[PDB]
Write an enzyme that holds these catalytic residues in place. Structure first.
Site, PDB file in Angstrom:
ATOM      1  N   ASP B  37       0.826  -1.204   0.000  1.00 53.13           N
ATOM      2  CA  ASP B  37       0.000   0.000   0.000  1.00 53.13           C
ATOM      3  C   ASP B  37       0.862   1.257   0.000  1.00 53.13           C
ATOM      4  O   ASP B  37       2.050   1.210   0.342  1.00 53.13           O
ATOM      5  CB  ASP B  37      -0.924   0.017   1.234  1.00 53.13           C
ATOM      6  N   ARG B  75     -11.002   4.860   1.958  1.00 51.94           N
ATOM      7  CA  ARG B  75     -11.583   4.602   0.640  1.00 51.94           C
ATOM      8  C   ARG B  75     -11.155   3.235   0.094  1.00 51.94           C
ATOM      9  O   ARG B  75     -11.937   2.555  -0.581  1.00 51.94           O
ATOM     10  CB  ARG B  75     -11.210   5.716  -0.323  1.00 51.94           C
ATOM     11  N   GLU B  76      -9.923   2.838   0.401  1.00 48.99           N
ATOM     12  CA  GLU B  76      -9.428   1.537  -0.009  1.00 48.99           C
ATOM     13  C   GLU B  76     -10.223   0.427   0.652  1.00 48.99           C
ATOM     14  O   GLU B  76     -10.620  -0.541  -0.001  1.00 48.99           O
ATOM     15  CB  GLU B  76      -7.951   1.393   0.316  1.00 48.99           C
ATOM     16  N   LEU B  77     -10.484   0.581   1.944  1.00 54.78           N
ATOM     17  CA  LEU B  77     -11.287  -0.410   2.639  1.00 54.78           C
ATOM     18  C   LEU B  77     -12.668  -0.536   1.989  1.00 54.78           C
ATOM     19  O   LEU B  77     -13.143  -1.647   1.789  1.00 54.78           O
ATOM     20  CB  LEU B  77     -11.441  -0.053   4.109  1.00 54.78           C
TER      21      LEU B  77
END
Lengths: 141, 166
Positions: B37, B75-77
């Site tokens: 990430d 937002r990734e989650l």
């Protein structure tokens, strides 16, 4: 048979040192971890293990004041090198905010020169790699 | 496009230099392709990250105290959560030194940072539900009595299993 003894305080026992012990173990080098936060009473069993270790690895709490830590915890580990003069000692200053100079001074005073340090530029994984290579070179030495 | 990819989702340079560095070394040791990430939010474009996540087969969502400071990480989650609902990826929640209920119910320092970052944002509710649902996926716990090296091996095992199963 021949093995390595890692000494450290409890705060790093289950994190950094476990990785260190796993890395040696992958490389076929038997090792045992001794906790120095134990008082001189239960420590009497661990003295046995350190003394017959070929390589003694001291993982120091580098964020702490050496004057408040050396005599209390690690003097007893270094004092096992007397009994076994074949034994070599490796020192690791581990920490994200090292009192680097205070510790370098302490290690000099005790007569230790073989030294590895945490650096912000390198991962703990790289640090472990550097220590395994040093130990290996000393292990058959 | 690479297609045995494991995405490692998390935040924190200290976490990257420590625990994650060992996890990464063990995965590479086992010839598993991993994507790290943007843990510093050094500004890799959001569309590139969300696309990398979608191209993955596995996502390791490592929840640490810093996860909820980043709008991009949250937002990734959400993207993780959306993709699992379409079945294109196996997700494995990793709880690094916090309890799962803390994540699920946005408690303590973890939630305070979340609430501060999402103040007056329209997507707050949808984000809240993701944090409530992702910790129900089986996952792996790391507390302060946990032997990290063992946990690294445990994670790698889960990844190997998931990859054979695809």
């Amino acid at each position: 048979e021949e093995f390595v003894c890692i000494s450290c305080v409890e705060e790093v026992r289950y994190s950094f040192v476990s990785h260190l012990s796993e890395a040696l173990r992958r490389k076929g080098i038997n090792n045992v971890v001794v906790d120095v936060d134990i008082d001189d009473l239960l420590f009497k069993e661990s003295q046995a293990k350190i003394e017959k270790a070929g390589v003694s690895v001291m993982v120091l709490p580098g964020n702490c004041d050496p004057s408040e830590v050396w005599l209390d915890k690690f003097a007893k580990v270094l004092e096992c090198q007397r009994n076994n003069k074949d034994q070599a000692v490796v020192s690791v200053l581990y920490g994200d905010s090292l009192l680097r100079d205070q510790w370098l001074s302490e290690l000099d005073f005790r007569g230790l020169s073989r030294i590895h340090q945490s650096r912000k530029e390198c991962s703990d994984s790289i640090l472990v790699e550097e220590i395994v290579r040093d130990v290996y070179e000393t292990h058959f030495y | 496009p690479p297609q045995h990819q494991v995405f490692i989702n998390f935040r924190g340079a200290d976490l990257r230099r420590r625990f994650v560095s060992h996890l990464v070394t063990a995965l590479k040791l086992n010839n598993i392709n991993v994507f790290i990430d943007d843990y510093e939010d050094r500004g890799q474009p959001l569309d590139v990250l969300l696309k990398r996540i979608e191209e993955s087969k596995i996502v390791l969502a490592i929840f640490s105290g810093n996860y909820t400071e980043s709008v991009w990480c949250v937002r990734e989650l959400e993207k993780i959560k959306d993709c699992t609902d379409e079945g294109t990826l196996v997700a494995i929640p990793i709880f690094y030194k916090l309890e799962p209920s803390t994540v699920r119910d946005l408690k303590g320092k973890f939630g305070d940072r979340f609430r501060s970052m999402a103040k007056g944002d329209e997507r707050k509710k949808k984000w809240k539900e993701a944090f409530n649902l992702i910790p129900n996926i089986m996952g792996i716990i790391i507390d302060k009595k946990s032997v990290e090296s063992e946990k690294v091996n445990e994670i790698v095992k889960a990844v190997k299993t998931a990859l054979t199963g695809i």
